[PDB]
Design a protein around this ligand. Structure first.
Ligand SMILES: Nc1ncnc2c1ncn2[C@@H]1O[C@H](COP(=O)(O)OP(=O)(O)OP(=O)(O)O)[C@@H](O)[C@H]1O
Ligand SMILES: Nc1ncnc2c1ncn2[C@@H]1O[C@H](COP(=O)(O)OP(=O)(O)OP(=O)(O)O)[C@@H](O)[C@H]1O
Ligand SMILES: Nc1ncnc2c1ncn2[C@@H]1O[C@H](COP(=O)(O)OP(=O)(O)O)[C@@H](O)[C@H]1O
Ligand SMILES: [Mg+2]
Ligand SMILES: [Mg+2]
Ligand SMILES: [Mg+2]
Lengths: 478, 471, 471
């Protein structure tokens, strides 16, 4: 029994300085005398800087620090499914220990250029606006950005719930949230039945800053474990701005000189290193995939701030939610002009692509034309037709909370909209039209739904037109 | 022996040196008791709290009072425990300072009474309770657009002189007088006159028998202003846990806590953060706020006033506290200047309780339609500012016509505000609020003048005062 | 023999101490090759570049890969030369990292192949070329308002998500398949997914046999991100000098070079500059940019994508980059939000080739008239938004009528944007676009609806689209 030893020189604010530890390794785990763990970050000439991963109250100057010989690691395995754990893998739900028998490094290289394959298979969220305007595919990284109280958490929860029958593992990572909010989210997932395939990683606001800094890396390592076995994983980072704040706090406490807005120099490298590990692996690598949903909270809707622009420059697209749209009645309040998907088209079913290839550009043009026509007084026929179509599209894209819609019904309603069958319906009646149309499809259009569901392509346009016309005859305009 | 020695004195920060192997733990309390040895010295009685271990057997502390008179070489006593304040039945009807010493002149607390450490970890994940229940307050805008949650955390934001204290007093008057549980008031960095007024008001109304108060007002040093809120929270946690009570916790200004932290942090040797704040701003706020929660044993509902410096809502201190709240009401100087009180911003204020399955379908519809009309009205303000209402379309004219009346009807006369003006206050049930706003939206009262909707209460009073004036 | 040892590891920056009188020169490459002594160590194979001579026989270096695993006291090997990468016909068809090691798993480069150092001085004033010749791209706005120059330097500016990568890919598609020389692509701090997509597209189209690719994408440390561009540049310089070939050089995002420098500046120990950048920003940019040029021996035509942080064109990095370019394309999310792509700013974009004696008198007059019309339209929007369209004069109404159609006709459908537009792309000759814009200015198509001008190509496609729309 022998171990390389050090002694503590300074303690405070979750940061410790140690003398000795000559053979310590950069990024290695160390343990203190009372059992609290730490990670060595700065290897200076005569002292070591350590971030403390736990309560530092019981650590005093002169205490002993011991090497572990292990690079920072977290437990991984199937035993984490359905559990709530902290970034170190310690359970916090009170349901007993976790029986993992394997671990992964918290810092690992991303798959290379030759290890990847282009994203080609959709991830259905059940939300019409997302699945039509900003498609998401397996292996993609889509940012969800907006001010507080705009629906960011609701979108992610609905997306996780919708994966129930699609054979995918979900990982929900909460950084800097209230434990009561985390418990509410866990109870919602349990009620809707999504906890059978979900891992919840939590690091609340009372925890020390290094745990908030490490939580997304622990989540992505847990996801990578399943990715390299051929599975498909969905990971949600509920706030990246909060680890940005935590990392700023750590850097300032470690006497690293600040940069813009007191942020450290490598604030971009932090998030880029985290998010580059989500990918779609090639067939030679097993074909597994990991897909990520980072969150960023803006101030007063300023999408051009430092951290929001840093994150936007990394991901494969963003969904921007606006409070002014939120209060004007359009929900989930996606701004079509400022939202984009960098994988669009390739991440859609063939029928959805056919019916909605140009929908986002049409909405952007409609918004421009609506802004312009507010100044004029005598619009011509083309501008009247475009405005009517745009208003009807806007009204079709509305949706309520916790109301998933199958893709085969999304494509049919989008077809009905885009082929002009809604032109004679008044704007205030199209939502009831959509509801009664879904009922009509459930009753009399099962062959069309089955054809779409089995072939991923539209039926022959004659029969589908006949069905729409029959529903038009049945429907009554109020 | 566990005896220290003063090495450096830099304002509220003191460095103390101990013998090797006898350093006090972080957050321990230290005592300095010195008698003047000659005419060039003064008597000293001071309490310090450990903050950092500097190395070389040196400890850096924060003082709980003024450090004038300290001399290098003074002896320091280590108590071996954090600050401990009395808890239990003895605290009801009493007034305390940050150290747990009574200041109401009613007598000292016996030395054998139970007292608890100020610092403790937050409750575990499995202990929490997450049920949602509406707390009726009798205020129209709060009950309609951002209902308060029983057992949850409520924050009130505002700049200087906008109405935070008046709204706190109105909420106390409407809720605490009949609560039937235990109430705790914590005055952090506010006027001593306000604390005296509150004490006398509670004593006169008889609520004093079931409440405890702790004061850390503006005249105090930053260390006391930092720890007074924790003292109050420690007193409240006892009633929550050991007795299973329901507790009302009122905090006079939680921004002063972080402000005092930022004042101290510079002298501790930390590198400044974005706007000169301490680098540890988020962790300290989280460690204070995570303790204020409802559990299975009992529930704590807290109403906190939050100061917004220079009316900047993007300031780091107001910005970081938003994530800790279940319901927020934002006050605006623009509304306050137009005579609208309590001057609540109807679009920025939010609540988790505004959902059809919690408040009801028609309540939800009415609230959403009111917010929609107000948003549309806000979008036109530049056009009205430049050239008025004359070039608006017919739809927008009706939008403005309805929105001005809705905005005025959101005002109310408070019971507490009867000292500023002779008009007595009113208590409006939520059913009445919903019915009145639905009637306004339906266009029933388009013919009434817009000045008849100011500061009335129920919708019938609008008709009554319109009749009283010319109509 | 001369061996150093690691004395300090601070993230991506490592300090090495050598024996007296045996210090490596600045920019020399060092190797750490460590075999694990026991189960508490890991194997290391790392490359470092010398940056500063700290004094006292100590050197400060920047790592080319992750420094996790390093232990103080590890042995360091000095190679005696900067990073050297293979050049010649061997590099064609291969994909490399920053160190010149192939990553396409097609096999290793023979150890006796010629290798050139990464760092060299720029060409002199005597040996430059200044002839201006038009490079046709098939893009309407580029060919009309800001023509590209053969052998010149072209920069594409834009904020995040405006179309820089799509424009780069369209330029590759239109130009590289028939260039007849050599093309080099350098990926600097961009998405590995985009790199893989581009590699597979080139491999499918067959251009890969004529191209060398180097990748330094976002996951890499700052040292790799700041040396990958120089690796690609020296690979291209070999073909410019030793063979006299015409070379196309595409750089994925040149802003990441500056960003990596700023990331390591503080750890290197340099005082911050105005917006947090390094003091040596301009010098570091110039030492790289001045090497990318045409000479008497050969010509290099280069297209560089330049990121604009927070859409602020006054940011020091793009502001400094502006002076190094002959032609410039400015992308605005104001246009991108409106549905116009490629979203080129028609006024801010400039080119040295837009002169009457280069493009022709008719082309020059048409371009200037288009710019005048758009500039006039820009001023009218402020008063339109307030006073409506009815209050304009008949001349201003006609200006608006034609400017809207011109702005829509500057859009185009790209071949590489089928996944975004749903329709195949188009190629438009410069004569065709000049004639079409001349006809629009003359008013031949005033009766056409303005939506028919969106994303079409030639002018006859507008007529066909309007006929399909039923006009
Ligand atoms: N599509 C929708 N329809 C109706 N209400 C919605 C919709 N989406 C979200 N909401 C409501 O809006 C509120 C805010 O939603 P949510 O909490 O998900 O947003 P957020 O941006 O994650 O918030 P926070 O900043 O508080 O974490 C909630 O009350 C939620 O029920
Ligand atoms: N509801 C109200 N009715 C009438 N007057 C009011 C009301 N609310 C506030 N005022 C007026 O505004 C003044 C300031 O109110 P208050 O003391 O609550 O402000 P505050 O936001 O707490 O200010 P401070 O930052 O100074 O503590 C009151 O003295 C009173 O004149
Ligand atoms: N010519 C175009 N046609 C259609 N869509 C485009 C075009 N150019 C850009 N876009 C849209 O913009 C998005 C982002 O563009 P990108 O190439 O990523 O620019 P950047 O490199 O500046 O981020 C793409 O996903 C695409 O949908
Ligand atoms: Mg949220
Ligand atoms: Mg006040
Ligand atoms: Mg790009």
């Amino acid at each position: 029994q022998v171990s390389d030893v050090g002694t503590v020189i300074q303690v405070g604010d979750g940061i410790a300085r140690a003398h000795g530890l000559d053979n310590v390794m950069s990024g290695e785990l160390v343990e203190f005398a009372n059992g609290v763990m730490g990670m060595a970050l700065n290897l200076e000439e005569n002292n070591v800087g350590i971030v403390i991963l736990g309560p530092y109250t019981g650590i005093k100057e002169g205490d002993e620090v011991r090497r572990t010989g292990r690079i920072m690691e977290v437990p991984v395995g199937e035993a984490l499914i359905g559990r709530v754990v902290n970034p170190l893998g310690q359970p916090v739900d009170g349901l007993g220990p976790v029986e993992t028998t394997e671990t992964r490094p918290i810092e690992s290289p991303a798959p290379g250029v030759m290890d990847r394959r282009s994203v080609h298979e959709p991830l259905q969220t059940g939300i019409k606006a997302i699945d039509a305007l900003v498609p998401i595919g397996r292996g993609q990284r889509e940012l969800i950005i907006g001010d507080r109280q705009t629906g960011k958490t609701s979108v992610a929860i609905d997306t996780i719930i919708n994966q129930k029958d699609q054979n995918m593992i979900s990982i929900y990572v909460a950084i800097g949230q209230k434990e009561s909010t985390v418990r509410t989210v866990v109870e919602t997932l349990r009620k809707h039945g999504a906890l059978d395939y979900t891992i919840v990683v939590t690091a609340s606001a009372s925890q020390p800053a290094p745990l908030l800094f490490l939580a997304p890396y622990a989540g992505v390592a847990m996801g990578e474990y399943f990715m390299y076995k051929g599975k498909h994983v969905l990971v949600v980072y509920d706030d990246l701005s909060k680890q940005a704040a935590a990392y700023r706090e750590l850097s300032l406490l470690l006497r690293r000189p600040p940069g813009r807005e007191a942020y450290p120099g490598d604030i971009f490298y932090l998030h880029s290193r985290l998010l580059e590990r989500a990918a779609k692996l090639s067939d030679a690598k097993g074909g597994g995939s990991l897909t990520a949903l980072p969150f960023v909270e803006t101030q007063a809707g300023d999408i051009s701030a430092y951290i929001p622009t840093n994150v936007i420059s990394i991901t494969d697209g963003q969904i921007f939610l606006q409070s002014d749209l939120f209060f004007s009645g359009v929900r989930p309040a996606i701004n079509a002009g400022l939202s984009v998907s960098r994988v669009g088209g390739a991440a859609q079913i063939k029928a959805m692509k056919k019916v909605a290839g140009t929908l986002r550009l049409d909405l952007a043009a409609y918004r421009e034309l609506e802004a312009f026509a507010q100044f004029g007084s005598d619009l011509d026929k083309a501008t009247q037709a475009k405005l009517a179509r745009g208003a009807r599209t806007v009204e079709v894209l509305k949706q309520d909370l916790h109301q998933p819609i199958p893709v085969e019904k999304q494509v049919l309603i989008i077809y009905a909209l885009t082929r002009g069958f809604l032109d004679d319906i008044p704007v205030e009646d199209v939502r009831r039209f959509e509801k009664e149309f879904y009922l009509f499809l459930d009753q009399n259009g099962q062959h069309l739904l089955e054809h779409i569901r089995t072939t991923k392509d539209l039926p022959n346009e004659d029969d589908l037109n006949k069905a729409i016309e029959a529903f038009k005859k049945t429907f009554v305009v109020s | 022996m566990t005896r220290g020695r003063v090495i450096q004195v830099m304002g509220p920060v003191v460095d103390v040196k101990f013998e090797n192997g006898h350093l006090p733990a972080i957050y321990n309390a230290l005592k300095i008791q010195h008698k003047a040895r000659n005419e060039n010295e003064v008597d000293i009685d001071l309490t310090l709290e450990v903050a950092l271990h500097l190395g070389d057997d040196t400890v850096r502390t924060i003082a709980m009072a003024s450090t004038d008179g300290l001399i290098r070489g003074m002896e320091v006593i280590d108590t071996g425990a954090p600050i401990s304040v009395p808890v239990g039945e003895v605290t009801l009807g009493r007034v305390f300072n940050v150290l747990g010493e009574p200041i109401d002149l009613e007598g000292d607390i016996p030395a054998d009474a139970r007292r608890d450490p100020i610092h403790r970890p937050a409750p575990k994940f499995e202990e929490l309770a997450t049920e949602v229940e509406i707390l009726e307050t009798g205020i129209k805008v709060v009950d309609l657009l951002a209902p308060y949650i029983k057992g949850g955390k409520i924050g009130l934001f505002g700049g200087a002189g906008v109405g935070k204290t008046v709204l706190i007093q109105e909420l106390i008057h409407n809720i605490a007088q009949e609560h039937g549980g235990i109430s705790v008031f914590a005055g952090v960095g506010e006027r001593t006159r306000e604390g005296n007024d509150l004490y006398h008001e509670m004593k006169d109304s008889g609520v004093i028998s079931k409440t405890a108060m702790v004061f850390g007002q503006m005249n105090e040093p930053p260390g006391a202003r930092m720890r007074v809120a924790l003292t109050g929270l420690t007193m409240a946690e006892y009633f929550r846990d050991e007795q299973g009570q329901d507790v009302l916790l009122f905090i006079d200004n939680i921004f002063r806590f972080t402000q005092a932290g930022s004042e101290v942090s510079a002298l501790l040797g930390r590198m400044p953060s974005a706007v000169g704040y301490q680098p540890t701003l988020a962790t300290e706020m989280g460690q204070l706020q995570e303790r204020i929660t409802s559990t299975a044993k009992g529930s704590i509902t807290s109403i906190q006033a939050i100061y917004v410096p220079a009316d900047d809502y993007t300031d780091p201190a107001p910005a970081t506290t938003f994530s800790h709240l279940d319901a927020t009401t934002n006050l605006e100087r623009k509304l306050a200047e137009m005579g609208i009180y309590p001057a609540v911003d109807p679009l920025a204020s939010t609540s988790r309780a505004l959902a059809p399955e919690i408040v009801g379908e028609e309540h939800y519809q009415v609230a959403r339609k009111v917010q929609q009309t107000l948003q549309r009205y806000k979008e036109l303000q530049d056009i009205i500012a430049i050239l008025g209402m004359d070039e608006l379309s017919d739809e927008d004219k009706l939008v403005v016509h309805r929105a001005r009346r809705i905005q005025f009807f959101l005002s109310q006369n408070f019971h507490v505000a009867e000292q500023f003006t002779g008009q007595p206050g009113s208590y409006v049930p939520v059913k009445e609020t919903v019915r009145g706003f639905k009637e306004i939206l339906e266009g029933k009262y388009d013919h009434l003048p817009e000045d008849a909707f100011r500061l009335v209460g129920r919708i019938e009073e609008v008709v009554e005062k319109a009749k009283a004036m010319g109509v």
